[PDB]
Ligand binder design. Structure first.
Ligand SMILES: Cc1cc2nc3c(=O)[nH]c(=O)nc-3n(C[C@H](O)[C@H](O)[C@H](O)COP(=O)(O)OP(=O)(O)OC[C@H]3O[C@@H](n4cnc5c(N)ncnc54)[C@H](O)[C@@H]3O)c2cc1C
Length: 286
């Protein structure tokens, strides 16, 4: 039994993914020795960077032996020329095969793309030779978007990518308990959504940082979950890692959940996050 439990944990941790901002290239260089070659590393898209900064980060990811995944924030783009400015820049520096497309955090779109589907269905990703497009998933819903609109958006984006012959994957918002993603993942399989799913996990970080992100992201923080994950603001430790969620995922994930990997959000710093992964695997004997 210990042997089979270790094997299931080793499979779940195979091909885990990471992310950086354009400000984190030095951290990536320091972390690289213990990051598996080929690891998918996102470059998130948020205000406060130039396209050149994002392209340089993606280039370094590739040079270090990893697979860059530029994020595209639809609502931050003014028009097709704006998007092509970034895509042309990326195509010139990386093997542009993976992107991740989201509506973006603006409350009001800045341009011609209302949401991720508007960008995806425009055809532009196919023009640039993209073979993999990731999309969001929200097992606990979203503060601004109804469950029904989230599900329809997922179905419409999957349908658009299928029509264009572009493979897709899903990356979920993190949670502080495994129950929402376990239920939600089986449900999307039932609706015929069979693409690979990367279950998002919050990396080890200060409890205050985790709770601030969770409030902004609409992540559940019921009393029972806060106690189980260890998120008390009077905690003697002051930080929390994702082991409570991993401990439910590894035994309960099954064939009914389909193709599943893990994604780590480095809320506490990329080096700290990957060191946690290395040390967790070591303590579990994998
Ligand atoms: C894994 C992951 C990575 C992310 N990375 C980034 C990132 O790099 N940069 C970033 O800015 N954000 C990022 N986000 C956040 C995401 O942009 C926001 O959650 C956004 O509010 C919704 O984007 P979406 O792609 O899920 O929405 P979509 O699937 O595009 O939209 C879902 C539905 O809601 C509508 N809609 C979209 N936005 C709103 C709104 N604000 N109010 C009401 N209806 C709306 C759409 O028209 C559509 O009908 C990420 C989220 C996830 C889960």
């Amino acid at each position: 039994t210990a042997t089979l439990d270790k094997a299931a944990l080793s499979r779940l941790f195979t091909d885990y993914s990471l992310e950086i901002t354009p400000k984190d290239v030095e951290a990536l260089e320091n972390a690289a020795h213990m990051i598996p070659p080929g690891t998918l590393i996102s470059v998130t898209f948020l205000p406060g960077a130039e396209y050149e900064d994002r392209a340089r980060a993606a280039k370094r990811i590739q040079e270090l032996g990893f697979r860059p995944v530029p994020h595209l924030s639809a609502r931050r783009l003014i028009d097709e020329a704006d998007l092509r400015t970034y895509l042309d820049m990326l195509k010139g520096v990386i093997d542009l095969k993976h992107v991740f497309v989201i509506a973006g955090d603006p409350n009001e779109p800045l341009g011609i793309y209302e949401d991720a589907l508007a960008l995806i269905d425009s055809g532009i990703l196919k023009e640039y030779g993209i073979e993999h497009c990731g999309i969001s998933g929200y097992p606990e819903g979203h503060p601004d978007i109804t469950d029904e609109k989230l599900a329809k958006a997922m179905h419409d984006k999957v349908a658009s990518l299928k029509r264009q012959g572009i493979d897709y994957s899903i990356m979920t918002q993190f949670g502080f308990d495994a129950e929402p993603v376990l239920e939600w993942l089986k449900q999307i399989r039932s609706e015929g959504i069979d693409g690979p799913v990367r279950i998002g996990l919050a990396g080890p970080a200060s409890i205050k940082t985790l709770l601030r992100f969770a409030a902004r992201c609409g992540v559940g923080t019921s009393a029972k979950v806060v106690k189980k994950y260890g998120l008390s603001i009077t905690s003697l430790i002051g930080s929390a890692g994702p082991d409570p969620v991993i401990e439910d995922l590894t035994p309960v994930l099954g064939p009914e959940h389909g193709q599943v990997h893990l994604h780590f959000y480095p809320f506490g710093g990329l080096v700290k996050t990957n060191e946690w992964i290395v040390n967790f695997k070591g303590k579990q004997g994998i």
